[PDB]
Amino acid sequence: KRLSAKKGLPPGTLVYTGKYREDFEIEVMNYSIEEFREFKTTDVESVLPFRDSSTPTWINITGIHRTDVVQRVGEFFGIHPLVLEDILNVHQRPKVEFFENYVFIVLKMFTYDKNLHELESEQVSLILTKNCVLMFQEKIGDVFDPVRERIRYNRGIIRKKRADYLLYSLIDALVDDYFVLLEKIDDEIDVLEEEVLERPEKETVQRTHQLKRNLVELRKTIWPLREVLSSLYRDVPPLIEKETVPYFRDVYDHTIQIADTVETFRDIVSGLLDVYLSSVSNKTNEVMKVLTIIATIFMPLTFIAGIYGMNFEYMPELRWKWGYPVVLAVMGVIAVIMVVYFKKKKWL
Amino acid sequence: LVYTGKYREDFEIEVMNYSIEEFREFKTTDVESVLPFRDSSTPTWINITGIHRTDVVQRVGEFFGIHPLVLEDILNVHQRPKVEFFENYVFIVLKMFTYDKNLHELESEQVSLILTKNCVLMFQEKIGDVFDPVRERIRYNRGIIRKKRADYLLYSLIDALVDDYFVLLEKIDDEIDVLEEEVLERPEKETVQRTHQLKRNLVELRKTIWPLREVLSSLYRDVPPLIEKETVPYFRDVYDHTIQIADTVETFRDIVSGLLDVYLSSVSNKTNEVMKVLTIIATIFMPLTFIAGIYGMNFEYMPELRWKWGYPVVLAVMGVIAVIMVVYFKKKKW
C-alpha cells in the first residue's frame, strides 16, 4: 500500500522512468462476434467510455511518457496508484499482481540490431479489467501485429472468446518474438565464435563481452517470465476462465524452452572467453616460432664466424687449402641438417 | 564497559531544549549540569560528542535508566545497526560515513540514540558531525518540530542521516563517472586500484545499509506507542528513502563489476604485438650480421680484389635481403 515517498519530489509524484519521449498514441480495438471497430486517436477522453462496454476491448496507449494520460486512465478505471507507479517504472522485472477486479502484468519485449549489437528493452504492461485489456508501451513498434491481423480478418478463435483469450494471445505473441530473438542471437553467436578464432582483436573481445552481458540481461528477465506464467496458469484467478488455462500451460512450456536456450548460449559465450585467449596464444606462438627458428639457425653460425674471425697473433687455419670454402660447406651442412631437424612437428 | 573506539581526544556535551515558543542551548563538559533535565516536560536533546570516557556514559546510563547490555552495546563500536524496544525507552544504532573525494577512503563513526520520555540521548564518537541542519531548524523555527514531542526529534535525526547517505551517494556517483571515463579512455594499474577500492566501498555500503531498512521497518510497521501514532507516517518516508539508497547501491555495483573486464581480457593482446616487433627486427638483423661475420672471417684465401664495387655489391645484396624481408612482413601483415 501507499505510493512510495521518493525524496526530492513533491509527495505522490508519478514519474516516467524510461527514456523514450518521442511518440504518443492511443489505439482502440473493440471486437465482438460480428462487428468490430478501430478507433485510433489521441484525445484520451474519447477512449474512456469503453470501460463498461459489453464486448471485449483492446486499448493500446503507446508513449507512457505522458504521465497525465496514465494517471487519468488509472483513476477512471479504478487502478491503484501503486500499480501506476509500477507501470511508469520501466526499470523492473516481469511480474504479476492479482487484484479483486483487474490483473496487472509487467512484461518486457526486446529488439536486436545488426551492425550495432545492442539488446534494446522496452517494458510493456497489461491490465485486464472486466471485459477490457489496457496496454501500456513507450515506443512505436511492437510484436502484436499478428493478433491485430487475426482480430481484423476474423481468422482463429480470438473473435469468438472473451478478453482472457485476448490476454493469452498477447502473451503468446510476446513469447513468439522471444523465440525470434533467440534465433537472431544464435546466428550472431555463431558468427562471433567463427570470427574469434580467425581474427582475434580487441573488438572481438568487446563484442563477446557485450554478448555475455546481453545474455545475463536476458536470463534475469526470462526467469521472472517463467514465474509470471506459472502464476497465471496454476491458481487461475477469477478474472481468467477455467477453459483458458491450457493455453497458459503451453506458454509456460515455451518459457521453459526459452530458459534452456539462453542457458545454453550463456555456456557458449563462457567458452568463447577462454577460446579467445587460446587463439591469441596461438598467434604469439607462431610469431615466436619464426623468431626462435631464425635465432636457432643463425646464432651458432654467427659465433663460429666470430671465432674464426679473430685477431690472434697465431696462424692456426688462415692459410689452409681453401679452408674458407670448407668452413662454409660444413657450416651450411649443419644449418641444413638443423633446419631438417626443426622440420619435424609444426614449427616449420 | 570496555571502550574500543579509536577516538579518544574529543569530548563535549551539548543540550538543546525547545518548546512551542522558546528554546535553550547549553554547552558543558561536567555532567552535573545535564542531570536535572528530566524535569523539563518539553522535549530535550543531549549529545555526548566523545564517548571514550566510560565514567560519564556509565553515570548517564544509571541516571536516566539504561539496561546494562544496551549500554555495553553503546560503548561497543563494531556493531550492526539495531533497534531495541523497552517500556521505559527505545534504543537505536546508526552509522555515519564520511568519504573524502581527494583522499579516497570511506570511514565510519557509530551513533546510538536513546529515547526515554522526552529526552533524546545521542552518543557521538568524535568531532565532525552531520546534524547541523536539524540544529539550525530547531534554532530558527521554520518547521514542525516545535509542535511535536521528542519523537519527531528522533525522526529528524534519522532523516538527516539518510540525507547524508544521499550526499555520499552523489559523491560516489561522481567517482564512478570519472572511473568509467578513465577506463574507456586510458587504463592503468592505478585505474584497477580505483576500481577495486570503489567495489569494496560499495560492498561495505550495501552491507551496512541493509540493516537500516529493517531498523526503520521495526520503527514504523509494528511500532510501540512510545513512538506515537502521529509520528508513524513520518518514519514511513524515511523507510522509503532507505529503499532508494539500496537500489542505487546495487546498480552501482552492476556498473562497476563489469567496468574492468575488457581490460582483463585485453592484456596478453599486446604480447603478440611486442613479439611482432622483436621478431621482425631479429629476422632483419640475424642473417645480416651473420653475413657480416662471414665476410669478417679473416680467411684471406678467396681474392678480396676491388672488383666492380664489391663492397657496394655486398651492401646492395644486404639491402635486397632487407627489402625482401620487409615485403615478407607486409605479406604476413605483422
Partner: antibody, heavy 123, light 106 residues
Framework: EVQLVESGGGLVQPGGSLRLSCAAS????????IHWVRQAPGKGLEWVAS????????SYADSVKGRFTISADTSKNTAYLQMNSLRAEDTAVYYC???????????????????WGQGTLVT | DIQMTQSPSSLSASVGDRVTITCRAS??????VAWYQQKPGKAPKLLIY???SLYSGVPSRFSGSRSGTDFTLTISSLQPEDFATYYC?????????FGQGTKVEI
C-alpha cells in the same frame, strides 16, 4: 496545443503588491509542476518559484525566499504568483513554464521545462 | 548554496564549425543539467536534458557530454539559425540555478 500565457505585468511603483496569473491550455496544471522564471535585460535567466499543485509542494528562490507567494487553482487550471514589497532590481521579464521530471538514478531525479510561456514584463 | 559557472562568457564562430560551451558546478550534480536556446525577445527552448539526452523533436547537431562534475554542450555543424544564448541548469535540488549565459554570434 499546450500553451502557457501570463498576465499582470505592468508599471507598479517599487514596494507595491501585484499578482501574476499563468493560464494553461492543452494540459492540466494538476499533473505537472509550474515554474516562474525571471530574466533581467542584459542578464541571464534566473529561476524564481516552483509550485506542484498536486500537493502543497512550494519552493521559492533563495534570493526572494519568503517574499513571493506561488500557488495554483485547478478550477481555472491556472497558476498564481503574488509579488509583495518589490525591489528596484525586480524589473525583468517573467516566464511561466511547465516542467516534467525524469529519472537518472534511483536516488536522484531531474526535471526539465518543455513549454515556456511568452513572459510578461514587470517594472 | 550552489552555482553553475558557464564558460566562456561569449563565443564567436563561423557557420558549420564545432562550438563547445563548458559549465562547472559548485557542488556535485548527478546528471540533472539542461541546455537551452534563447532568441532575443523570445521564450527559451529546451535543447538538452539529463546532460546527454537530446530532446524530442530537435536537430541532432546539438550534443551533450558529461565529464565528472563538468558539462559540455557541443555542436557538430553550426547553422545560421543557431546564433543565440545557451544556458546551463541544475535540477539536483528544488532550488534551480541557471548558467551565466553564453551568446554565440557569427
Amino acid at each position: 496545443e499546450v500553451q502557457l500565457v501570463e498576465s499582470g505585468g505592468g508599471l507598479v511603483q517599487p514596494g507595491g503588491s501585484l499578482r501574476l496569473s499563468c493560464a494553461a491550455s492543452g494540459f492540466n496544471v494538476s499533473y505537472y509542476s509550474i515554474h516562474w522564471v525571471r530574466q533581467a535585460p542584459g542578464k541571464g535567466l534566473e529561476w524564481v518559484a516552483s509550485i506542484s499543485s498536486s500537493s502543497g509542494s512550494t519552493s521559492y528562490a533563495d534570493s526572494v525566499k519568503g517574499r513571493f507567494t506561488i500557488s495554483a487553482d485547478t478550477s481555472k487550471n491556472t497558476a498564481y504568483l503574488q509579488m509583495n514589497s518589490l525591489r528596484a532590481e525586480d524589473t525583468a521579464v517573467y516566464y511561466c513554464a511547465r516542467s516534467y521530471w525524469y529519472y537518472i538514478w534511483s536516488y536522484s531525479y531531474g526535471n526539465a521545462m518543455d513549454y515556456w510561456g511568452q513572459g510578461t514584463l514587470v517594472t | 548554496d550552489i552555482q553553475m559557472t558557464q564558460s566562456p562568457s561569449s563565443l564567436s564562430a563561423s557557420v558549420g564549425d564545432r562550438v563547445t560551451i563548458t559549465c562547472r558546478a559548485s557542488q556535485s550534480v548527478s546528471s540533472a543539467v539542461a541546455w537551452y536556446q534563447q532568441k532575443p525577445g523570445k521564450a527559451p527552448k529546451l535543447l538538452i536534458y539529463s546532460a546527454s539526452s537530446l530532446y524530442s523533436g530537435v536537430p541532432s547537431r546539438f550534443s551533450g557530454s558529461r565529464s565528472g562534475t563538468d558539462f559540455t554542450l557541443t555542436i557538430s555543424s553550426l547553422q545560421p539559425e543557431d546564433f543565440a544564448t545557451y544556458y546551463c541548469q541544475q535540477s539536483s535540488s528544488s532550488l534551480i540555478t541557471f548558467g551565466q549565459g553564453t551568446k554565440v554570434e557569427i
